[PDB]
Design a binder for this molecule. Structure first.
Ligand SMILES: Nc1ncnc2c1ncn2[C@@H]1O[C@H](COP(=O)(O)OP(=O)(O)O)[C@@H](O)[C@H]1O
Ligand SMILES: Nc1ncnc2c1ncn2[C@@H]1O[C@H](COP(=O)(O)OP(=O)(O)O)[C@@H](O)[C@H]1O
Lengths: 755, 131
């Protein structure tokens, strides 16, 4: 039967769209905009409008949430689709709002909600369905109770709409909305895919795999900083697959007077095991099963042992699945990782860059943003925030917007009419004000992300690009030839050269091109884990790097310890041995199959430990020279993209004139150019202001006080105070080391001996 | 690296269980690599691991002298800087015989080139004598 299709998550959020692949339209002779009739479970029915979309597969149908609840089906089931061309324009429509959606509106719902939603839409509806309308601050659902003709009709301008009456009370099998689905999660695509991979099958079809016989998972650990939304993920999964989500809180089991805590745990487990595909969620696991030495009393030991024995006693059952949420995966008791207990660990990292954009677009759904709002700019500016912080920021912005216009009713016991409340355009000013007075929470957290620097930010280093390409991209692209030819791929690369230049940009660019996460460790951190402890930090950072493969670990300023202990200070050498031994050991213990590179940059190469430069460790050495002439003009071109231009002075002339400079110096010069431009513009504005205060209305209209374009004179002023950052002696020393390492490589070719 | 790590504290335990594990799983050939690293890290601008150095060497020596000939446990130590090793090691009963490994020459070079020449893709290739 080539008519049925399996439902799937959609992208278009309109209430009357479906996404079919073009071969399906070719097979079923389906046009665009036709009316199709959809049959599903429970003998429910609805109509929709076909839209073209190539992303979905041929056997797969994409559809939104309102129609999915209309059909009383969940994702992964089957529906029947057909053309339905006999529908004609309706005559009259009777709609009635739901009781638990309009609490406190008391206004003309027809002019507020129905009129824009039904405008020039031609949305076909069927009697008995429910559709959701976005509005001022809330969402209102209407259940169409009567239409002419029945059951099918199409919206036309000359149709009768009745929106008066006692709101209908909620149904039972309606699958109440406002419950979190898959659209309420953003910035967690990969981890959500991983969770859905191993939980969908044992929950949707429970008997089939058991008949086959496999070991289904019996525990999933979700660990991450608080506020990232782990409970949201668990609740969304439970409400989507179909289960009996039974949360048990952390402190609630500790507040009970001793004896009945174990009784509560036992009752919870025995209740959850009977309701069939159940999903228990132990929130705040570390509160009841902490590290062993933390516990002092005896009730904690009894509670922990009770939990462990219940977990071991869970044998198959009705496919009950337990998930526990913790803060960091080293605080729980180590005994809760044996096989059979919690064994699969899935992390939920802090959203970065784009993820903040999706979170903000999810939260700023109901509110009517003004056209000047740039959500992308706010997302780019704000970092160190988690989901809860963004929600609080949006709420504070809404309240700031609503307070300055408190002349609305302030007296009427009946709540505000939707009319004025729909005339609130939250602007950029409110968002900036709310952002100003808000303290973040993440802050000091290691950031794992994809850097956005392209291979155009740098201009020179043409052959170093080739070397890095060979070292990095090929092993993950064509492993077959490497494994056949016999070589083990290189695991480390060490950079060395004059300070500044472009090491960090090279690392970020290669991480971007290879499309893998980037983790940076600075010298200050190395010394921080050099004056006190030395072991914990290295273990945790390497574990984090390994778990997020692929990634490009970076060790900036590896020579800092050698510089520090090379002076009068001679006591921290033991910790230096500690740090170097940790780095050596957890490079030696890394399996070559895992794709985790290591890159280190040193200003002074000679004084570093020669034990590192051994096979199986950082081996390849790449020399990074000082850019000269032709590279420098590209450096300037890359730097001065900014926003203004320099159409007057020639870049090539200053490239020729400034030979022997590092990139940092050129960026400094370009920055002082902007500083001079800002000074001149601001002093011009001040002069213009005072010349109005001398004579009121001196100029009715203003002019272009110095145009945002960096002139030549600013360039000369900024260039007059120029610096030669590096002296020649370091250049000779680096060249001497280069020729010394090259002198071991000396030989006078061949003649094809013994052909 | 592990030997250098076990200076700072844990200078008794780790040696104890490694020797115990070597003894219980007899026969075995215990291997100590980079034995000169002790005094190599000892010498420098720090001079603070010297107590750690002597304690590690002394647990090694005490456990070595406690061996019994009944168990076939063989100890081999390797180093590349012999002039710096503590002389107390070189006594009868402890590590005594000294064997010098010279650089490969002629037939040794051919043999190692052949040994490294297994691979899957060697094709038919050419002579290795001249290399
Ligand atoms: N896509 C999202 N990602 C992360 N957090 C979100 C997202 N959408 C909403 N949130 C916020 O997460 C909060 C719930 O998370 P919470 O249960 O506190 O996690 P935890 O309890 O682990 O800190 C909600 O109040 C919501 O504002
Ligand atoms: N295309 C480029 N070539 C060389 N240097 C550049 C280029 N673009 C920017 N720079 C400058 O080079 C500097 C790199 O120095 P930095 O990353 O701080 O330390 P490191 O010495 O480890 O690279 C940056 O501050 C940046 O301003």
């Amino acid at each position: 039967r080539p008519n049925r299709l399996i439902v799937d998550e959609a992208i278009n959020e309109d209430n009357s769209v479906v996404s079919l692949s073009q071969p399906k339209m070719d097979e079923l002779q389906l046009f665009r905009g036709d009316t199709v009739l959809l049959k599903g479970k429970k003998r429910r029915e609805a109509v929709c409008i076909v839209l073209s979309d190539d992303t979905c597969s041929d056997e797969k149908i994409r559809m939104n949430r309102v129609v999915r609840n209309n059909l009383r089906v969940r994702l992964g089931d089957v529906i029947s689709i057909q053309p339905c061309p006999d529908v004609k324009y309706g005559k009259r429509i009777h709609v009635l709002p739901i009781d638990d959606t309009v609490e406190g509106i008391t206004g003309n719902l027809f002019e507020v909600y129905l009129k824009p939603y039904f405008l020039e839409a031609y949305r076909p509806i069927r009697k008995g369905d429910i559709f959701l309308v976005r509005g001022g601050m809330r969402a209102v659902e209407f259940k169409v109770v009567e239409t002419d003709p029945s059951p099918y009709c199409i919206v036309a301008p000359d149709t009768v709409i009745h929106c008066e009456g006692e709101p209908i009370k909620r149904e039972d099998e309606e699958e109440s909305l406002n419950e979190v689905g898959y659209d309420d999660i953003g910035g967690c695509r990969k981890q959500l895919a991983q969770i859905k991979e191993m939980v969908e099958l044992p929950l949707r079809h429970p008997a089939l795999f058991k008949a086959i016989g496999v070991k289904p998972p019996r525990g999933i650990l979700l660990y991450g900083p608080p506020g990232t939304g782990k409970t949201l993920i668990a609740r969304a999964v439970a409400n989507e697959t179909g289960a009996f989500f039974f949360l048990i809180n952390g402190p609630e089991i500790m507040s009970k007077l001793a004896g009945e805590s174990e009784s509560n745990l036992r009752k919870a487990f025995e209740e959850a095991e009977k309701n069939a595909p159940a999903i228990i969620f132990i929130d705040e696991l570390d509160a009841i099963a902490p590290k062993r030495e933390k516990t002092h009393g005896e009730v904690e030991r009894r509670i922990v042992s009770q939990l462990l024995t219940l977990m071991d006693g869970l044998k198959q059952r009705a496919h009950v699945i337990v998930m526990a949420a913790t803060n960091r995966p080293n605080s729980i008791d180590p005994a809760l990782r044996r096989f059979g207990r919690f064994d699969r660990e899935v992390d939920i990292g802090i959203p970065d860059a784009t993820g903040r954009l999706e979170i903000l677009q999810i939260h700023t759904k109901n509110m009517k943003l003004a056209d000047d709002v740039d959500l992308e700019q706010v997302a780019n500016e704000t970092h160190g925030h988690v989901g809860a912080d963004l929600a609080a920021l949006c709420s504070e912005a809404a309240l700031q917007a609503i307070r300055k216009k408190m002349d609305l009713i302030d007296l009427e016991d009946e709540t505000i009419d939707a009319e004025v409340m729909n005339s609130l355009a939250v602007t950029m000013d409110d968002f900036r004000w709310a952002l100003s007075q808000s303290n973040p929470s993440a802050l000091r957290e290691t950031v794992v992300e994809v850097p956005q620097v392209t291979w155009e930010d740098i201009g020179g280093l043409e052959d170093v690009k080739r070397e890095l390409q060979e070292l990095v991209q090929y092993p993950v692209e064509h492993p077959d030839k490497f494994l056949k030819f016999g070589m083990t791929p290189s695991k480390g690369v060490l950079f060395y050269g004059p300070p500044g230049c472009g090491k960090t940009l090279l690392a970020k660019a290669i991480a971007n091109e290879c499309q893998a996460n980037f983790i940076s460790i600075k010298g200050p951190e190395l010394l921080t884990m050099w004056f006190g402890e030395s072991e914990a930090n290295v273990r945790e950072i390497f574990d984090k790097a390994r778990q997020a493969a692929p990634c490009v670990l970076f060790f900036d300023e590896l020579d800092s310890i050698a510089k520090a202990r090379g002076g009068n200070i001679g006591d921290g050498g033991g910790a230096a041995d500690r740090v170097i031994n940790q780095i050596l050991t957890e490079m030696d213990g890394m399996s070559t199959k895992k794709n985790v590179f290591i890159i280190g940059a040193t200003n002074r190469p000679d004084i570093i430990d020669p034990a590192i430069l051994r096979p199986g460790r950082l081996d390849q050495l790449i020399y990074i020279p000082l850019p000269d002439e032709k590279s420098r003009v590209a450096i300037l071109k890359a730097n001065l993209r900014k926003s203004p231009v320099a159409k007057d002075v020639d870049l090539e002339f200053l490239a020729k004139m400034t030979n022997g400079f590092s990139g940092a110096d050129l960026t400094e010069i370009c920055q002082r150019a902007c500083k001079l431009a800002i000074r001149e513009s601001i002093e011009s504005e001040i002069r213009r202001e005072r010349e109005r205060q001398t004579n009121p209305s001196a100029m009715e209209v203003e002019e272009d006080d110095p145009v945002p374009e960096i002139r030549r004179d600013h360039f000369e002023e900024a260039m007059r105070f120029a610096r030669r950052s590096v002296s020649d002696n370091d250049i000779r020393k680096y060249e001497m080391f280069a020729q010394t390492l090259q002198q071991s490589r000396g030989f006078g070719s061949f003649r094809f001996p013994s052909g």
